[PDB]
């Protein structure tokens, strides 16, 4: 039930362990432009939320 | 620049450390992952500038 652009849902998400690996098996992931955070280190840098 | 300043750059990806007072200039691809790049830099092969 994904959303559309106009409506979008936010999840607050406080308490989890956040490994950014699954989801290199989702999918082949043809879009992914990332930001200055570098993505090979995701583990080390912590997030307030 | 209005537009864009695209003429400075800075690395991402390293293999390891870098000790005091050295220069890394490498315009390489960062083979992450097991797929062997070729030069083709795909997913998990991302420019380190
Ligand atoms: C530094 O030397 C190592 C080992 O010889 C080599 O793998 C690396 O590419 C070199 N880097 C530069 C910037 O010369």
Same mark, same amino acid.
């Given at each position: 039930?994904? *959303?559309?652009?106009?409506?979008?849902?936010?999840?607050?998400?406080?308490?989890?362990? *956040?490994? &950014?690996?699954?989801?290199?098996?989702?999918?082949?992931?043809? *879009?992914? +432009?990332?930001?200055?955070?570098?993505?090979?280190?995701?583990?080390?840098?912590?997030?307030?939320? | +620049?209005?537009?864009?300043?695209?003429?400075?750059? &800075?690395?991402?990806?390293?293999?390891? +450390?870098? +000790?005091?007072?050295?220069?890394?200039?490498?315009?390489?691809?960062?083979?992450?992952?097991?797929?062997?790049?070729?030069?083709? *830099?795909?997913?998990?092969?991302?420019?380190?500038?």
């Amino acid at each position: 039930r994904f *959303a559309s652009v106009y409506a979008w849902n936010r999840k607050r998400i406080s308490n989890c362990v *956040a490994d &950014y690996s699954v989801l290199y098996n989702f999918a082949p992931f043809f *879009a992914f +432009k990332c930001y200055g955070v570098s993505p090979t280190k995701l583990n080390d840098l912590c997030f307030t939320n | +620049k209005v537009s864009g300043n695209y003429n400075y750059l &800075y690395r991402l990806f390293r293999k390891s +450390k870098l +000790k005091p007072f050295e220069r890394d200039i490498s315009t390489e691809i960062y083979q992450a992952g097991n797929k062997p790049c070729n030069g083709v *830099a795909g997913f998990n092969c991302y420019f380190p500038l």
